[PDB]
Amino acid sequence: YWRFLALLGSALLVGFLSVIFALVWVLHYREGLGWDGSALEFNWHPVLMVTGFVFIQGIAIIVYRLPWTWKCSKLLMKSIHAGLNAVAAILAIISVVAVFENHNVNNIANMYSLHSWVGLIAVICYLLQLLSGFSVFLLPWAPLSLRAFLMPIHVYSGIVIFGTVIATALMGLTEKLIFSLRDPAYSTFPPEGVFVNTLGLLILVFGALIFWIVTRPQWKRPKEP
Amino acid sequence: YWRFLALLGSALLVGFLSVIFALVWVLHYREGLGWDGSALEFNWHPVLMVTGFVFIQGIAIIVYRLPWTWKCSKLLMKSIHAGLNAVAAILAIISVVAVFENHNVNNIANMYSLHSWVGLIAVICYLLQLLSGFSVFLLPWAPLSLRAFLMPIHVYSGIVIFGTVIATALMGLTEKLIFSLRDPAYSTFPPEGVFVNTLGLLILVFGALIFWIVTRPQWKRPKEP
Ligand code: HEM
Numbered sequence: 144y145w146r147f148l149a150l151l152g153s154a155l156l157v158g159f160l161s162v163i164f165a166l167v168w169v170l171h172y173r174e175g176l177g178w179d180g181s182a183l184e185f186n187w188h189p190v191l192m193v194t195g196f197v198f199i200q201g202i203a204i205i206v207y208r209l210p211w212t213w214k215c216s217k218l219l220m221k222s223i224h225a226g227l228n229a230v231a232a233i234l235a236i237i238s239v240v241a242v243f244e245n246h247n248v249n250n251i252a253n254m255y256s257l258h259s260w261v262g263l264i265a266v267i268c269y270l271l272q273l274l275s276g277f278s279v280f281l282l283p284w285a286p287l288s289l290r291a292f293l294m295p296i297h298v299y300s301g302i303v304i305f306g307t308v309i310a311t312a313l314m315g316l317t318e319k320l321i322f323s324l325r326d327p328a329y330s331t332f333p334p335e336g337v338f339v340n341t342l343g344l345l346i347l348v349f350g351a352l353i354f355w356i357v358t359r360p361q362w363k364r365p366k367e368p
Numbered sequence: 369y370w371r372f373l374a375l376l377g378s379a380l381l382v383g384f385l386s387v388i389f390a391l392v393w394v395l396h397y398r399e400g401l402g403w404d405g406s407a408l409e410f411n412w413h414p415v416l417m418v419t420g421f422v423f424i425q426g427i428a429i430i431v432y433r434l435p436w437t438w439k440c441s442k443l444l445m446k447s448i449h450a451g452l453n454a455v456a457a458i459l460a461i462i463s464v465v466a467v468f469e470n471h472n473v474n475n476i477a478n479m480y481s482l483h484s485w486v487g488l489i490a491v492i493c494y495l496l497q498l499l500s501g502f503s504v505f506l507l508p509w510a511p512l513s514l515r516a517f518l519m520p521i522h523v524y525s526g527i528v529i530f531g532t533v534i535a536t537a538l539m540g541l542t543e544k545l546i547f548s549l550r551d552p553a554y555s556t557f558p559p560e561g562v563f564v565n566t567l568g569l570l571i572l573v574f575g576a577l578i579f580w581i582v583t584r585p586q587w588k589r590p591k592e593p
């Protein structure tokens with residue numbers, strides 16, 4: 144228990160510092176936020192991706208392992224899981240609408256990067272996991288046999304989508320640092336560069352923590368009757 | 369069994385195509401290979417990283433789950449594991465010596481990027497997992513109690529290092545594409561750009577496959593007497 148608490152506490156801390164770091168970066172180092180800057184719009188992209196796709200999704204993935212929930216309703220904890228993942232799907236979609244509207248308004252090319260390829264698949268895989276998870280594991284009519292062998296795919300896919308989001312995030316930080324830190328150049332170790340590398344590491348440590356919590360068999364929600 | 373075979377076969381295929389794709393890219397799209405180009409030297413970096421740190425390490429991680437090995441010697445399969453990981457440690461170190469020698473000869477800055485921060489920690493964590501794994505699990509004097517609770521950390525850390533290498537690789541592809549595809553620009557969808565994005569996806573699919581194999585409890589090497 145109290146090593147779980149300490150680990151949950153650590154992941155919340157690093158997860159909140161990531162969101163904090165993403166906000167300071169766009170509000171104090173970049174131009175800020177707005178729904179047409181248009182770089183004030185683009186900046187919603189990293190902010191909302193860190194906040195929903197990395198942080199809120201990180202918490203949805205461990206929601207069933209909070210021991211205060213074990214003798215809670217399984218339908219209820221399915222609802223918090225479903226709902227916390229839906230919030231991150233909304234924010235991530237909004238996040239992608241930000242780049243497309245900044246790009247199209249500014250006549251920039253779309254979908255040429257490995258970041259955007261990996262990312263757009265992450266997003267599509269995410270919605271499919273959300274739609275499939277809703278009709279099979281929340282919704283009532285599905286055959287309990289189809290439950291039995293979709294479940295290993297669903298647990299694996301969620302960890303693998305969550306890992307791929309983190310790898311897309313560090314790619315997006317990389318692109319945006321390189322595009323932006325032209326003078327002083329990124330390679331000159333400017334403060335924005337040290338700061339956002341540290342945001343990169345924080346997003347890293349958060350994933351490692353979420354992956355630790357979620358693979359402790361002693362912390363699985365105890366199977367139902 | 370035969371779904372394991374098919375999955376092992378798939379991961380070997382995508383793992384070999386990654387190495388192939390990394391070679392074609394530097395030999396047919398870039399300047400080629402050499403031990404002083406000096407871009408002929410830098411190119412050893414992605415080639416050796418994909419080959420040893422992603423591919424050979426991907427195979428070392430699943431070496432205990434080959435069913436042809438289950439009634440093999442555990443000391444022997446510890447030796448293939450140890451040895452396959454040592455080969456990737458050598459290649460990765462060599463790979464890092466390539467960038468430092470290209471940078472220092474060409475007066476480029478070192479260790480300013482998130483790619484290099486994450487990567488250098490991956491490398492250091494890798495060697496520590498290798499040194500710790502050698503003295504605790506190959507070597508004979510360690511208390512069987514210290515075996516018992518280092519093992520969960522060692523399995524977790526190997527998956528987490530392997531994931532972080534993949535995320536570093538896609539960052540390195542991102543940087544190198546952006547630095548290089550200046551004219552025709554990356555954003556103009558040039559063939560090198562489509563090709564190396566596809567190398568990025570292949571490295572992705574390889575990790576997802578290695579992670580699938582390595583988390584099937586039905587495929588764990590059956591515990592010893
Ligand atoms: C993209 C969205 C989703 C992701 C990434 C996701 C991811 C995951 C992950 C990683 C686990 C294993 C966590 C654990 O061991 O506690 C899990 C468990 C589960 N998910 Fe989801 N999930 C998503 C959407 C849904 C939805 C909509 C439902 C519908 C009810 C659902 C139902 C479940 C159930 C029943 C479990 C097993 C709970 C248990 O351990 O007893 N998921 N999910």
Ligand code: HEM
Pocket residue numbers: 188189192193196239242243246252253254255256258259260262263265266308309310311312313314315316317318319
């Ligand atoms: C990890 C979650 C993320 C996902 C799923 C994601 C997904 C995407 C997608 C689909 C695009 C293409 C949009 C377009 O073509 O207009 C894109 C573009 C971009 N993203 Fe992200 N992104 C994520 C995180 C980040 C972060 C944290 C940053 C850092 C600022 C970032 C920086 C960028 C930049 C600069 C572009 C435009 C250049 C390009 O097309 O590659 N992204 N992202």
Ligand code: HEM
Pocket residue numbers: 429430431432433446447449450453494495497498499501502505506507522523524525526527529582588589
């Ligand atoms: C950086 C290098 C290393 C990495 C990334 C690594 C990674 C891993 C991973 C991911 C597993 C779990 C695989 C599975 O379930 O089959 C594992 C298992 C193991 N590793 Fe390592 N390892 C490394 C070095 C070593 C070394 C040097 C030894 C020394 C003998 C060692 C001994 C073991 C043992 C005994 C197991 C458990 C085998 C079993 O399932 O019965 N590893 N390693």
Ligand code: HEM
Pocket residue numbers: 413414417418421464467468471477478479480481483484485487488490491533534535536537538539540541542543544
């Ligand atoms: C995934 C395994 C990888 C690791 C552990 C890794 C690690 C590193 C390290 C430590 C550096 C800094 C070297 C220096 O400062 O001179 C670096 C630089 C670099 N890497 Fe990688 N790398 C990997 C994969 C890749 C790949 C696949 C590419 C694609 C070509 C790449 C491209 C670069 C580039 C262009 C640099 C120099 C610019 C910079 O300092 O960021 N790397 N890498």
